[PDB]
Amino acid sequence: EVEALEKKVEALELKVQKLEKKVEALEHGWDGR
Amino acid sequence: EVEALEKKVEALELKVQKLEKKVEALEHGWDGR
Amino acid sequence: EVEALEKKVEALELKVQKLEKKVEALEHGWDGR
């Protein structure tokens, strides 16, 4: 169902963005990490 | 191909869940991390 | 739009691969991590 896939992709995109932020934080040692 | 996209989304969802777990582990310092 | 969803999935797949690499690096302590 394309409409439902679209929702899942949109959710994954935000999830991946948030992971990218946390992982760049850990890699760079931002804020005592 | 919607059917193939569906499989890729379903795989990504599990991959993102597993990443979310590991990243929350690293952020929280679970188990000596 | 399936064509656009396909592009987003393909981008997410690479993003998730790269995250998987960085996270396995952090988990394993590769290279001083």
Side-chain angles (χ1 to χ4, degrees), chain B residues 2 5 8-9 12 15-16 19 22-23 26 33, chain C residues 2 6 9-10 12-13 16 19-20 23-24 27:
Chain B
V2 177
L5 290 179
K8 291 155 104 64
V9 171
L12 278 165
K15 285 182 186 186
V16 162
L19 282 161
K22 295 236 263 296
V23 169
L26 293 151
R33 284 187 177 73
Chain C
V2 177
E6 177 175 41
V9 171
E10 281 300 301
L12 278 165
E13 282 184 336
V16 162
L19 282 161
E20 284 186 338
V23 169
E24 291 294 333
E27 283 284 69

Side-chain angles (χ1 to χ4, degrees), chain A residues 5-30:
Chain A
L5 290 179
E6 177 175 41
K7 283 153 78 162
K8 291 155 104 64
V9 171
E10 281 300 301
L12 278 165
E13 282 184 336
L14 170 59
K15 285 182 186 186
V16 162
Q17 168 173 119
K18 298 168 65 182
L19 282 161
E20 284 186 338
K21 292 178 181 195
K22 295 236 263 296
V23 169
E24 291 294 333
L26 293 151
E27 283 284 69
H28 283 92
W30 292 335

